Amino acid sequence: METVVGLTAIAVALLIGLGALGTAIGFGLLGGKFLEGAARQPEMVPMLQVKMFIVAGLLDAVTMIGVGIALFFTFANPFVGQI
Amino acid sequence: METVVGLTAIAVALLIGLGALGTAIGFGLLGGKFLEGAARQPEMVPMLQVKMFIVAGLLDAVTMIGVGIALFFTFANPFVGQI
Amino acid sequence: METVVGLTAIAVALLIGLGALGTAIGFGLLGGKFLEGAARQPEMVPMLQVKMFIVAGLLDAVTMIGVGIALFFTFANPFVGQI
Amino acid sequence: METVVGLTAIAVALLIGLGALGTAIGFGLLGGKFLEGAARQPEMVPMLQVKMFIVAGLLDAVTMIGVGIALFFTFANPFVGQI
Amino acid sequence: METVVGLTAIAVALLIGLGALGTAIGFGLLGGKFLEGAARQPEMVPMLQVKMFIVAGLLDAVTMIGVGIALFFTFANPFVGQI
Amino acid sequence: METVVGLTAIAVALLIGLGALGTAIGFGLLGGKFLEGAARQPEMVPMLQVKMFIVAGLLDAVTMIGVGIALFFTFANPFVGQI
Amino acid sequence: METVVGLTAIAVALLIGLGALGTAIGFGLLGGKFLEGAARQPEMVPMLQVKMFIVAGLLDAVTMIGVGIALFFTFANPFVGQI
Amino acid sequence: METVVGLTAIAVALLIGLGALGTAIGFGLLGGKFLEGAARQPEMVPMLQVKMFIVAGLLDAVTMIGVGIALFFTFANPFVGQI
Amino acid sequence: METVVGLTAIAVALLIGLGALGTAIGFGLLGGKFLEGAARQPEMVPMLQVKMFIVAGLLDAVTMIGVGIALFFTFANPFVGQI
Amino acid sequence: METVVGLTAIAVALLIGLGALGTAIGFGLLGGKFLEGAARQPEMVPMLQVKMFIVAGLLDAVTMIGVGIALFFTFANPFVGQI
Amino acid sequence: ITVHCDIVSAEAEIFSGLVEMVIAHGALGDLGIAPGHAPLITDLKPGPIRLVKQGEQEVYYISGGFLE
Amino acid sequence: ETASGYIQHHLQNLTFGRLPNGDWGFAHTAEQAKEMGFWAFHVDTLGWSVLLGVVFLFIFRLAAKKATSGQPGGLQNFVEVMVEFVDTSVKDTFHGRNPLIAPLALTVFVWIFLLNLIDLVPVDYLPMLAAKITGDEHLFFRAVATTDPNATLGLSISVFALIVFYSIKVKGIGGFLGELTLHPFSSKNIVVQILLIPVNFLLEFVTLIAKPVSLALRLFGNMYAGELIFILIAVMFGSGMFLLSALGVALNWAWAVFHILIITLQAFIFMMLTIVYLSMAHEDNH
Amino acid sequence: MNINATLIGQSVAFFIFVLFCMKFVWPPVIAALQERQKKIADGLDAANRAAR
Amino acid sequence: MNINATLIGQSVAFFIFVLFCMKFVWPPVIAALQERQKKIADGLDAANRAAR
């Protein structure tokens, strides 16, 4: 049993860690271009915020599935019940 | 039994984690250029939105395959039957 | 018997996962410049769109071999017969 | 107990190491653009500053969920209870 | 034979996975410059498209060797013949 | 017990290493833009330098949380107590 | 002997895969600049194409050494001899 | 005893190798902008040089902590004393 | 010396593989700027080519030491002699 | 004893392998802006060349420490004496 | 130390002589120009140019133009 | 004694607990201290934190009492530079009229700076003098207050109470809950809005809770690493060897000079983030 | 490391200190700075009144 | 462990840090407040010259 439970602890760290790494870099790129556009055209700021959020919805789609499944593997375990 | 079941949690974590990392970084690059284009020509934004969604389909295509195979490996695991 | 089945589950995760990671970043780069070009030259978008699909065929070429071999290894394993 | 506990030190180190990796690179991207906007437009600094702090909370959110679950695996253990 | 066979599946997954990762990122870089050139000078497209295929031959050269060695290690095995 | 001690040494190294990697690449991005902004006009170098130190607090935050927990693992050990 | 063989299958996969990854990304950066230069100065293409092949000889210099050693470890084996 | 001694030699390679990787890329990013800014304003070089060395001390801050903990682990050993 | 011999095959793959990866990406960046400068001002090519070879010496300096050590561990072996 | 020596060969490959990877990418980022500065300010290239060597010593500071320790581990291994 | 600077219009000159530093509102962000700056051609914004002269200071309003 | 024992001793606080023997009781070993519940207090951490707060208040109040109106006294000149620097930092970050942000920011900056300042003196001077004065050669004692997570958490939780209070005071309870559920994603129809309220809460609540947790750990990390790196440098001299002691003194000086940057930056950054976080509880960004 | 009620004592001391300094540390110094501001402003206006 | 030698070595480092402080760190910050002290006197005097 202990190898399945121990490998599940690493699976959870791998699910959340890669999603944290990806979203932090993704928002550095997206938000960096929002500040660039806001600096050149300060009149466009109220419109651009809305457009940035559209992309943020696509950027967080898979990461939320990943952290949701990671929490599921800590409070429940579909592998431990299969041995 | 336990090694096949335990290594399938790592396989599921890699299928979703690597996909999440790529999709989050990919949309940061794509959306960042969309906001630059929207700031440059605000009259073309309705057209740039539909063109962005054409690319969004190509960008997430293999990621959707990987999260569909990871939810298949999680419920009714195909490797348990082979042993 | 179990070690080959355990290691082949991770081999399938490397084939789909590294392919998903690379293609999602590749289309973020390719598509970002497609939207920038379309935002710069609104009348050229129907010409740039066909050129993007010619490049999409090169970008996903090796990735389609990765997912093809991964699904082959999942259902008709060629390594389990060599032990 | 020895394998589950020794593999939890590696789990904790991947949760805070990948979070530290991504947020330091992300704030280098976001901040590198805030300093350029502050140089291009001296009068926009207070507006660019408040807009940078909106994105800064989005950038570290998932990393802080990983720093927090890592601290929880460091002073408590949901796996050892799984004997 | 069991560990040599189990490690051959990972070896094949690395050969095709690292090849797919590099080729997808490589065409994202080369492709973005072709679209930038096509947008700047639409009269140059016939020449730029031929020069892109000359570069595509250099870019995929080692990736195709990797896919060839991976297919060789899939339908045959030089390690298993050594016991 | 030796597996717990040995995997804690790798935990310390991943926890300090991925943080040192993130801090060095993150400040190379932030610092590079500070010098470019300083080159645009030297009268604002003191103002920009004050803004850089404010962002350094966001960038080097999680990297120091890892250095703190790692230095708590280089001598003391909360995992040894768990048996 | 079975370990000495099986680890050479992974050594060959790293040696060709990391070479394929670097060469594929490297030509995307070099080739993307060749298309940019060719669109700017069409009359200089005969000279730029020859200069690209000078750089291509330096870019692949170490990758071809890696492929040569990887084929040497595949059809011959200075490790199986335990020498 | 031997497992801790062997895994700490690799812990020293991760501490110095990940710090070497980050410090070499971080100075390529910071120094590329210092030479670009020195070409922009060759009369301001003395000022930009001091601002560059101030940031250089921020890059080699966590890397020197890791190069100092890694020399501690080669000439003394805090893990071996724990048996 | 199965352990010493085996793990040495991996060591050689890491030495030449990481060196090939860095050298191929490094020349993609250096060479991309050489073609840009050559297209920007064609009369500077005689100087720019010599300046590229000065940087190429610094770029490959550590990679060539890594390849030298990799061929030393392949035909001779210090680890097998130490026992 | 073999596990200490075998893992030491991999520690050595990680010390110089990660150093080669970071210095080659770092000199491509640094050298790429040097050629651009020389193309924009051709009469100032002697100054730009002198300014570049000040960054080269800082870019190679932690990487040469890794190379020095790697040679030390190969000819005077400090872990074999730790029983 | 001192760079030659001339403010010129289609109808008549506005300023001339040597200066120490020039501050102008360019098309993509403000600029601080000093002796020895690299070749730069740039569209200006409607706004003022401040010319530092060996220590005294001069200010002139402008309605647009090109900074060479 | 072994070096592991010296390091293990320095990493322990002076905990006070109600042991059955009598009304007042103190922990005598690391395990016995770890067995005490949350309802125990670190005598050393609190002693240094209240004392330095009173020392700062006393030197500032002596000057505030003797306000010359015109030309300031030698100490008053420094107090005014600090009041002007904080007022400037506040006016540049916050445009409201609330009088509580500037006194809070000055307190946060000067107090945290002094809590960190006691780290520059040799790490075992104070513990040895405290042990000799108390008459117990084996007393656990730590001078630097910010190297205890509890001290940094007390600062951030105190700031977070003010952030939630002002947000509710100006936006109203229904408005505050509204910002946590109606933004940033919104729609023209209720059928879509009900699908967006969990997404809005998932973004806002996570980004709200990360402020108090990051503030504490951001301050604790650099300082705890500073104290422990000084302890590792302190052990180097314990060998008695000439060349190794020569390396130790050179590293101690280089680390101490580098730490003059860290002590200043952590106090300044916690102040700026306090001002920034409070200023965005009086404004709306959707 | 070990979790204790130590944060309470420091937080309670801080809340009382933050309320005290706002009434006995900031008001005397800000008033002494506002007086000088007023004196510089009216002193410069005095020259404009004399010139008019 | 030579405890006394550690106290002397650390005291030497602390003395060198204070020597370095008096040589470079301390002179500018103590002088800046004294220059501000002069600037305040000169400003208010100028306002009083205008008042006369």
Side-chain angles (χ1 to χ4, degrees), chain E residues 27-68:
Chain E
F27 280 120
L29 292 166
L30 173 63
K33 287 284 164 190
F34 171 51
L35 298 187
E36 187 196 313
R40 194 176 290 118
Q41 290 152 266
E43 314 90 334
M44 296 268 73
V45 176
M47 176 197 70
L48 294 174
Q49 180 165 334
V50 173
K51 297 311 184 185
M52 157 177 266
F53 299 138
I54 291 172
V55 178
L58 268 50
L59 200 158
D60 268 346
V62 181
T63 298
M64 292 298 166
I65 291 169
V67 175

Side-chain angles (χ1 to χ4, degrees), chain K:
Chain K
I1 306 178
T2 65
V3 59
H4 194 92
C5 182
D6 293 334
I7 307 176
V8 178
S9 76
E11 299 183 7
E13 304 94 332
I14 305 175
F15 172 87
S16 183
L18 293 156
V19 301
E20 182 178 4
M21 151 69 64
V22 181
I23 303 299
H25 306 349
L28 297 181
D30 296 4
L31 299 94
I33 317 167
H37 188 289
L40 168 142
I41 182 62
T42 284
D43 171 41
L44 290 176
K45 283 203 185 78
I49 301 190
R50 175 171 61 259
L51 299 88
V52 175
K53 298 184 60 183
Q54 304 80 220
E56 185 181 357
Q57 166 188 165
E58 303 292 353
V59 177
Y60 300 95
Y61 193 82
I62 300 192
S63 63
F66 297 86
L67 171 60
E68 191 255 359

Side-chain angles (χ1 to χ4, degrees), chain J:
Chain J
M1 182 52 69
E2 290 206 49
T3 61
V4 175
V5 174
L7 294 172
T8 295
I10 286 180
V12 169
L14 283 167
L15 279 182
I16 169 160
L18 294 173
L21 172 65
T23 54
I25 294 172
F27 279 118
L29 292 167
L30 175 61
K33 286 292 170 85
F34 170 54
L35 297 187
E36 166 161 18
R40 296 181 190 255
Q41 301 274 50
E43 71 276 15
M44 298 186 202
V45 76
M47 181 211 74
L48 296 174
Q49 180 173 305
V50 170
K51 303 327 295 183
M52 182 188 70
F53 295 133
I54 294 172
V55 182
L58 265 56
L59 196 157
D60 262 356
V62 181
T63 67
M64 293 316 297
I65 291 173
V67 172
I69 293 171
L71 298 175
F72 165 55
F73 287 6
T74 59
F75 306 112
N77 198 174
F79 298 105
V80 167
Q82 306 183 37
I83 309 176

Side-chain angles (χ1 to χ4, degrees), chain M residues 5-48:
Chain M
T6 306
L7 81 171
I8 308 178
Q10 183 168 6
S11 303
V12 169
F14 176 75
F15 292 139
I16 292 164
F17 194 108
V18 165
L19 291 169
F20 179 86
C21 64
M22 170 177 59
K23 298 297 187 178
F24 302 100
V25 179
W26 263 76
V29 185
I30 197 170
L33 290 168
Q34 282 183 343
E35 292 162 0
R36 278 170 281 181
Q37 168 56 25
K38 288 170 59 66
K39 288 286 182 178
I40 291 292
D42 195 24
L44 288 167
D45 288 344
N48 293 334

Side-chain angles (χ1 to χ4, degrees), chain M residues 43-44 46-47 50, chain N residues 45-52:
Chain M
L44 288 167
Chain N
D45 293 356
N48 298 163
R49 288 167 195 138
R52 285 190 290 269

Side-chain angles (χ1 to χ4, degrees), chain B residues 1-75:
Chain B
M1 178 62 167
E2 70 294 342
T3 58
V4 175
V5 172
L7 291 178
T8 300
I10 302 299
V12 166
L14 285 175
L15 279 172
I16 300 180
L18 294 175
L21 174 60
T23 281
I25 295 175
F27 281 125
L29 293 167
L30 178 65
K33 285 294 180 179
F34 165 60
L35 297 186
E36 171 177 348
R40 271 189 47 88
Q41 296 203 1
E43 305 79 6
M44 301 300 172
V45 172
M47 181 270 305
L48 294 175
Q49 276 197 182
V50 58
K51 297 308 179 186
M52 182 183 68
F53 296 132
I54 299 304
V55 179
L58 301 170
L59 193 157
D60 266 353
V62 186
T63 301
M64 299 319 296
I65 296 174
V67 61
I69 296 290
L71 288 182
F72 164 54
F73 287 3
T74 302
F75 308 113

Side-chain angles (χ1 to χ4, degrees), chain D residues 1-28:
Chain D
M1 296 307 192
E2 316 69 18
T3 60
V4 172
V5 167
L7 289 183
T8 296
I10 303 293
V12 163
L14 290 174
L15 277 163
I16 295 176
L18 296 174
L21 172 63
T23 49
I25 292 172
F27 284 120

